[PDB]
């Protein structure tokens, strides 16, 4: 795994992860930092004469200040002409929709809330030893034009937009929006695999595998419909964290018949997260190369993700699920990801949007350092 | 314990709890589900012609939609004539009172907040393998007419109402309301045990065993006065989670003199929750058959139960206390239960009321699956 | 002055303002609407086949949906190269700073909160009869790189940035940020008036005219230092709304010595808003052509602007101050404006940022319809 | 009437209130300010060498900074020895109790919330022309030891403490706490009037004149029992603002039988606030020696006082009730006052506690400038 | 800390509970009785209908918890700061957020901590300590901070903290942003007579870069503190570093200066008892005086939502409280600061509650282990 390598001499009082991290930082380049500084001084003017740090412009035009600037995800460039998204390693897009919600709405603002709090972050992860600014190009293409009155029209919009981004070669990060969108995203991706199969790593307390809910393909039905697609095999759908009082019986039945794999929170913690991640990877990637990551923020215990429509006690703790994701994203390439169910109206201190931002950034960083992205 | 039995063939990549759960669901009946659907169409009219799912009425009458309907606890039937409560296996009642609180008030709304968020839940628990709708009859008899200006009059009201419900043969679930009510609930139950003894399983960070507080029998005093009752032995009062800066010295002294049993959070986690539950059960049931469960939401770490009047860091984590409760409620029958100190005005995303709802449902489900109820 | 003209025949049951408004709408062009629709489809792809309204792209690119898209002020174009701001009639810029606040901080997020809620608005005002999309070009140049640890360095940044925008010819709209910044904005503008004089229309409960506060030139001091500038005469500083318990005595004294004009809330409502506006305009523009509008959201009664660091009861009601602003902005050209003290952390449902947005838009609309802008 | 006097020359562009205010400030002394500065430097040490303002200590001791310091009401000295309260013109005391509430609790924190936000204020009112620091001595004696579980014991405590303060000669300002306490405060005052009679100016949407409520003397009953006291005549109870859906019929009946006077909000606004105040004063002071001011924050429209247990639409607007109170407190001496029903748990922006603080300071300032206090 | 057999107890108690129940039975009540007597004198005896004759008319001590003027745990306010040396412990606030690089609001940290601190009694069950009986605590209020000038604020904070530390009282500084750590350590170091000062720093952020937005903000305190001659960077132990907000220039400067860093995962995997041993060994190596700098952000965001720079993956409460207890039991501390609590982002006050708990547990362990009082 990731340990101190002896390339940069360091004293022995460091913890093991810290020692890896401090050395790793010393070996990272600064080229893209220098470019952003130079661009900011050109576009935002040199700072006033009383500013001692001559890297500081008059107008904010990069990372700093964190509390300033137009809110794109982690202050990535806004790509207005979406046909250019293939020029970037990673494309963030939003799917602001909550017509698939069976309890609270509000996740239509998921994309806005995630973008907003993502400004708090720098470009660099200490323990992962990655500086995204130096190692990958990220853009934000904004939001799908969703259709609140009609979930089927919304699916069509999301499949087309996500399919466009996936076909361009950029790694799509979809900010939801409720979990019904997982059907539309997977449907768009599967349309561009040339018949190859797509597995799914699904983090959620909810099984999301029933046919209809309140007479529509709501957030409780995405994987029933997705695994009806010929090149999306249900045997490669791995459902991580199922439990509680909101996994509906019709969804459990359909998943049994289709032979999805389920691992409860207790299953994963009792076996060890490292073992749980190995088992999930082996199933999801069995006989398939492309795997989609679908992360519902509700798989965390409610106290860590209060801003969601279907909160549940007894979920994962952050260090558990972040380790799980890091192992996944270090070990295998991913076709893309979506993070769904963040509902800012129920998230007063933005800690749910914060968690979602963290999940995205850890996944991207691990994809990068393990050679799967960039 | 609860493991896969081989009655329903299943592949080998399920986690152990998930494998048990998927099999268990396949063996559950659907009779009560079908009855509710049929009744809903009768009471709420057939749905409009454009509705494809003909199980859907015009007016919501039953579980769905979760965001709709009159808010009884888990949408159980309201039993206006409280003399009929004996017709049900379980009777939910509220005790909306906060005149016993020594810091923040607000738990007068505990019953309303618990009932409100209870709608989010289905009738079925995945990992416990139980569908309450199929296995037990539950009613909601509303609230005790509490007396905010007079804690003693409130006690008399609560003892009379709880005593009535307990004497009817229904399993009482009391929604608090502050912990002073634990005296009144136990006093009413003990009146109907034909002289038999009553033990108490008390989950809380606070001992609640002093004589008076601010000159009255407030939430720090219930078990001092409960264990003065001749058939309520203090040696069978087991206090789980005691710790922090709010266990008052006079309560500690009185509990010592009466020989109550205390296990701190750290005690329980270090020994192992399974071992802690075994020890608690042995002490509480030693020479008594009837045991009352008194659950203070404050026994959870503050972050999981922000909506309480006396929050404390360093409490249980949800998976710890839920396992504790599951073992208790699987191993022994309970005389009844109360869940106290939920204060919605300090609970923005309703995660405290959500925790309380989950505690009730897990306890009921374990009582049912283990043959103690329904 | 704005009444039905008889150019568009209308029935007689309309109210007078409605009759003006309905006729005015019928006379507005749609050219820029059509251009934005066409551009959106080009940049955002045609909508999916199931979408009937073929004006809808796959990706949101323009006004719709209001809940979608990157949050620039009223979804104006982000102008990354601030050297291009002179190409627009109006340039929005933020000054995210709260080192000048003497009670609550949080107005560093004022620009972000105003931009966010501004998406709720369309481009057209019913009762003012103005469609900004058709009549004026607006851009958003982002934020000044403020210096939270040093108010003087922040002033220097703000004066340089605002001076640049004002010098370019664009009408600057400065989103604050606390009222200390009033000094730095006026200082920047006055540097570019060719020695001509600058009056100030100041809406606030607070006089903001003392020398220092907590040893620095904080939000209680901006007009003391602004009127020390040779071409900023204190006799043309009109202070509208002063009152309550937070107008410090040293500020009252200095304003008296310098002969600023003050009208309290009660003065204005007692005389009539129309008369109050006449008096304020008469004084501010006496012997000067250029006047700066400095609007503190705290001049509204606290209930309308809870998200501010220095709230006060007894302020203006919205219809009173909006009428005041409309008369000002119809009657005379303005050199620019700033809206300060919006503090989103204290603004739960964003009604303070909503008020700020409304003030900007009414002022711009009145400048446009009266031939002072665009 | 308070008008410009021509004692301090001023230009003619000032509004009438502003002209009176600017002159009035120029005539106020600074003696007590200078004493506070000197005391602060002694007790808080001189500030660091880099501080230019040599009035600034190292430790905050006095008014500034407003965001700093121990929260007494408007940072008045805490008088720990309550036997010394007679040494002050005005004594603030809290009654933290909400056992008399018939809907929401939370007003037990009224005193704390009012004290907290009161730090925002200076010592001087612009439009009233009063500097409390220079003209009256104010102390804060903390809180009555209330008895949450027993409203009658709470009444006895409140009567004893308020009686003590009133008998000492200090003007009592009682921070509530629910309106049940109005009985206990008036009972304590009446005990020390030596047979002289007491009128009551009662601001509220609720009559608060029934016998019992939920079997106790709750906030709907204070004036039924107060006017049973021989020297508290019901004909001198003037009830200002009654209306809505929470004025109970038994209270209306009892007030009718006892011939209290009621003026609704619409009555007062339609007749004119100046005329309403004259009528209320006439009735309250008719044939009595002293009048008690009982102000329920609920008499304001809910939007201005969201933090209360019994909010109602259609109440007073701030400028209406502040004028009403100013006329009362300028025209007649008052025996004391209570401000009740502020409930901080429902007051997220603190604007309710702000309104309460403003009411107190306006009443005090008018008592002082009109020769009734100090 | 185990049951000692001094007070006979039955065998069904958990081990910590058994220690606790015995320990309470051995605590005195002298200072309790003095507080009761003082309250009746100063607040009057209660009304005749009150049966408990310890209850005054006016609240004047611990009770009721929801009542009274909010000093830290209702300790006496010491208006004359020249008298702070009469107390074992002196609480002071530093209400400043001009060092914050994202959210402000921590200027109210001191007010929010004082407010929620009223909920506590004077006694800890599992630590077996009654602070009212064993240590004298005062609250001297707040430093007069300077919101528009971070450097002037540092000078005020160094002068006030230095005064309190020089008086002999144990200073507890309520922040305020972590920029203030430079100023507090600077003030303490002036008064060590050349003696060296180590630092135990609980945080997700290294806080070791030179400037940030052109000033010495909350990301820079330890760069400038370890430039002080008697503040060795080798004795700066940084516990909890991780996430996406540990800036690269801070990591570089700490590497060059040879600070020690142990991530949350490092501590949890090695065991908190082992992590505390290692941290104490490094911090106290060749130094007697060690300062405790606790950023509330070292806890997972969900436990400390009221902060300007929250981060997932932090410590859980029982982990960090054990860590702190071992530190504060094993070694004396020169003082402590608790920083970054931002009440405007703390709706149910759970962040200020955590901060209060950290302070009380540290003080209680210092007392019971003979380092204070
Ligand atoms: Mn889910
Ligand atoms: Mn009322
Ligand atoms: Mn930190
Ligand atoms: Ni889901
Ligand atoms: Ni309890
Ligand atoms: Ni202002
Ligand atoms: Ni009332
Ligand atoms: Ni820090």
Residue numbers in the entry:
A (entry chain A), B (entry chain E), C (entry chain C), D (entry chain B): 4 to 377
E (entry chain D): 5 to 377
Direct quotes from the study:
Substrates converted by this enzyme family typically contain a guanidine moiety, which is hydrolysed to release urea. In 2021, a Ni-containing guanidinase, mediating the direct hydrolysis of free guanidine to urea (which is further converted by urease to ammonia and CO2) and ammonia, was described in a Synechocystis strain.
The guanidinase enzyme of N. inopinata was expressed in E. coli, purified to homogeneity and characterized as a homohexamer with a molecular mass of 240 kDa, resembling the recently discovered guanidinase of Synechocystis sp. This extension stabilizes the tertiary and quaternary structure of the guanidinase through extensive interactions, consistent with its notably high thermostability and activity in a wide pH range. On the other hand, in comparison to the cyanobacterial enzyme, the N. inopinata guanidinase lacks a C-terminal extension. In the active site of the heterologously expressed N. inopinata guanidinase, one nickel and one manganese ion are coordinated through conserved histidine and aspartic acid residues. Another notable difference between the active sites of the Synechocystis and the N. inopinata enzymes is a tilt of N. inopinata guanidinase Trp313 towards the active-site nickel ion. The hexamer’s ridges display a negative electrostatic potential, and each cavity marks the start of a 17 Å negatively charged tunnel towards the active site.
